[PDB]
Design a protein around this ligand. Sequence first.
Ligand SMILES: O=C(O)C[C@@H](CO)NC(=O)[C@@H]1CC[C@@H]2CCCC[C@H](NC(=O)c3nccc4ccccc34)C(=O)N21
Lengths: 87, 166
Amino acid sequence: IKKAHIEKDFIAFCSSTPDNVSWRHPTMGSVFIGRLIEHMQEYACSCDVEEIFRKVRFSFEQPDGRAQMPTTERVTLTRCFYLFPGH
Amino acid sequence: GSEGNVKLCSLEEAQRIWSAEIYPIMDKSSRTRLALIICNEEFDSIPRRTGAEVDITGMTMLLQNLGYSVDVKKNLTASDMTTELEAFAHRPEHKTSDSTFLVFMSHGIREGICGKKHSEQVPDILQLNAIFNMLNTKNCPSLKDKPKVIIIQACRGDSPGVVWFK
Ligand SMILES: O=C(O)C[C@@H](CO)NC(=O)[C@@H]1CC[C@@H]2CCCC[C@H](NC(=O)c3nccc4ccccc34)C(=O)N21
């Protein structure tokens, strides 16, 4: 028998910061989910999930009318998670 | 929703990033990837999430364009969510899989995700810790040493998250 870490190789990504609200469009859809789709399509080939989710936060950096900041929590990733689309 | 057409990676680029600090990837001829989607649109107490079906069309297609097999479960309680999370991990398809993705699209507070039977008097809150406990190496042995990504689309409170400046 051999021991192993109970929690490892996890990553959570939320739509807003704690004690704040996320913005959802009634006909177009959630601003966060839409932007995650725009970034994942373009950067899955050259960037990893940590590199991608960092770029996602940057597009929210300018607050006008409605403001929301995505956050990355409880990260136990020891390696780079590259998707490699097409393979 | 969105078309989901992802910009592909070339073999010229794939061989260029070769390392012991990259997660291993299985062969496409035998690998069985799994992605789970849970969305609450219709509610008894709090208002209906109009335009939620657009965000289901986007993610369900994008994850499928990344080789994953998508499962969509609509309008569930906190106790129903807990059973579906245990059923997803108990699937032996994870054994011949390199990664997994999970998306939660409902309402929320500081404590967690709200079910379809949630109210201010009698709540139905699902903590983020309960999700991490069910997906760990103790409860889920099939996903050992593998990436496990979790996406959350819900509120975290009531404040607008903004502060004025000069
Ligand atoms: O459903 C979720 O997960 C998000 C939810 C968390 O409780 N957030 C919400 O209910 C937030 C907080 C209050 C308000 C409630 C009424 C429902 C629709 C509204 N939508 C927009 O005001 C809106 N959002 C984005 C872009 C817009 C562009 C033009 C006009 C209006 C726009 C919206 O999302 N919320």
